[PDB]
Symmetry: D2
Subunit: 112 residues, 4 copies
């Protein structure tokens, strides 16, 4: 069966949800660009932890046990959340930036 | 004026675009979960490079010069692209995972 | 007062200590280069966590409370341990690699160019 | 044949060399703890780039070509240099911190528990 993502939330949805979440807690002050970047590095660390001891031969993440799948979902999400937060705090239009980068990626690697 | 992200592309759009991009180049084989994770770490490194020498007093990323804004857009995008690729390769529904994580974030930090 | 590191352990000492530690536990198999690299990334993450919510204006790490200083020591050490392990597992002579890199750094940034 | 690191430079030697290097260029101001941490993350990124597209099956770093080995040496060194600089800037005695962490590691993972 095809794997797909759910159609929502969108990146804008996530931006808004996170901005609201921060604003309700008066956390704007903690969400400066370098704080968010360091938090992002922390989350990439947590994501790496999930993979660090995995052998080549053992089951891959598509087949990980329930607890490990939950962890993987959560850390992938933490990374995305801070990345969205950081892009928003820098006034970067992340969806349109990705389109531009994908276009550049196509040029740098022609199908050839 | 309000800052917002463009409404598209969505995360599914990005998943599809990237999957197509990889498939046209026969790059599936290089896109194993640990490859994608290491590539993601590389991109977070590139993003860090943009910030590493910034003083506290100098202009923040909202006011960076054109070349630096372009770089910032591009690396934020590279991070997102690999994160999407990795989540997809692990069969994680990244948008719905984020909703779940945001719900958990609300519980762990009640507005209080 | 001038700050300095202790004269030992050296990087070789740390290589040996870690190799001893791994070998007693039969952990060689877990210490392939990409495992060690990913573990290193994890530790850099833990180190970053300690700094992530520090403001610009507030006191630096020299003034952090005992628990935070202990954490900082521990994560800096975890990073170094894996870095040594990884360099060893790749047969890189890490101390001499640093000499070579410092020499390269001097050339890329001559004093009279800043 | 048994692999070992050179006996020097030591971590103190590297601290001094980096401090000399920075001071000649008047780079102190750029070497605040969070700058050094972010620079470290950048270098871990460069190190990861070297491994990112390596397959599971293909030869390990011991067999990489001369250019890739040089890069590996250089990035491992950049990581260590910033790590030393950061530890020094935080007044952490990095060699003794590693001793303490190794002792902690032994307790958290006793041999008879694996
Ligand atoms: C503590 C804290 C959390 N989060 C959100 C973003 C992440 O998805 C999640 C991480 O929380 P923790 O660091 O407690 O795991 O909560 C956030 O935006 N800002 C914060 N100051
Ligand atoms: C070389 C390569 C690139 N990219 C894409 C994802 C990133 O957005 C961008 C990064 O390319 P580079 O590493 O050349 O900067 O291109 C990818 O998906 N897979 C690859 N094997
Ligand atoms: C679990 C494990 C630990 N360590 C050592 C290196 C670090 O200094 C510390 C990390 O332990 P933990 O991931 O449990 O915090 O212990 C190691 O070398 N190899 C392992 N397979
Ligand atoms: C630009 C710069 C360099 N280096 C040193 C530490 C690393 O070993 C190497 C990094 O140089 P580059 O970022 O240009 O590759 O040079 C440093 O200590 N401080 C700096 N402000
Ligand atoms: Mg997390
Ligand atoms: Mg990039
Ligand atoms: Mg640790
Ligand atoms: Mg480097």
């Amino acid at each position: 069966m095809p794997f797909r993502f759910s159609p929502e939330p969108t990146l804008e949805d996530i931006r808004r949800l996170h901005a609201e979440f921060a604003a309700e807690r008066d956390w704007e002050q903690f969400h400066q660009p370098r704080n968010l970047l360091l938090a992002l590095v922390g989350e990439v660390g947590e994501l790496a932890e999930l993979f660090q001891w995995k052998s080549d031969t053992e089951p891959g993440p598509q087949a990980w046990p329930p607890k490990e799948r939950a962890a993987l979902q959560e850390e992938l999400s933490d990374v995305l959340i801070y990345l969205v937060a950081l892009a928003a705090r820098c006034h970067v239009d992340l969806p349109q930036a990705v389109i531009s980068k994908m276009d550049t990626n196509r040029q740098r690697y022609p199908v050839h």
